[PDB]
């Protein structure tokens, strides 16, 4: 009489709490809250989506310049601020988004 279904558990508050409300990575398998980790909860980022703890530069693939690490606010990707074209001299303060995503409306748009 037991279900023993507990683990991957929030790595910041160590809850189970909602799981659908939490994001769950592929690589690792771990979950993380909309507020422990202050993210948008949108639903782009929910299909496709990465901890910070495995998200790498998907143009260097190489983690470690954490720091330097522009993280998008819609496709949640992580790309250096070298590693962007242009690149970004410097970090904005708040509110960034990538060349994927700027990607204005253009194209036979179908159903
Ligand atoms: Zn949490
Ligand atoms: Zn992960
Ligand atoms: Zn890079
Ligand atoms: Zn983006």
Redesign the pocket.
């Known amino acids: 009489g037991s279900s023993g279904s507990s683990g991957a558990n929030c790595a910041v508050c160590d809850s189970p709490g909602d799981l659908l409300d939490q994001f769950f990575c592929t690589t690792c398998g771990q979950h993380y809250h909309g507020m422990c980790l202050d993210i948008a909860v949108t639903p782009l980022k929910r299909a496709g989506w990465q901890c910070p703890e495995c998200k790498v530069?998907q143009?260097?693939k190489?983690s470690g310049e954490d720091s330097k690490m522009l993280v998008c606010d819609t496709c949640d990707k992580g790309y250096?601020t070298f590693?962007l074209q242009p690149v970004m001299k410097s970090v904005p303060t708040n509110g960034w988004k990538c060349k994927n995503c700027r990607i204005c409306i253009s194209g036979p748009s179908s159903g």
Do not use: D
Request: hydrophobic letters at 0%; charged letters at 0%; aromatic letters at 0%.
């Open positions: 530069c143009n260097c190489q250096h590693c």
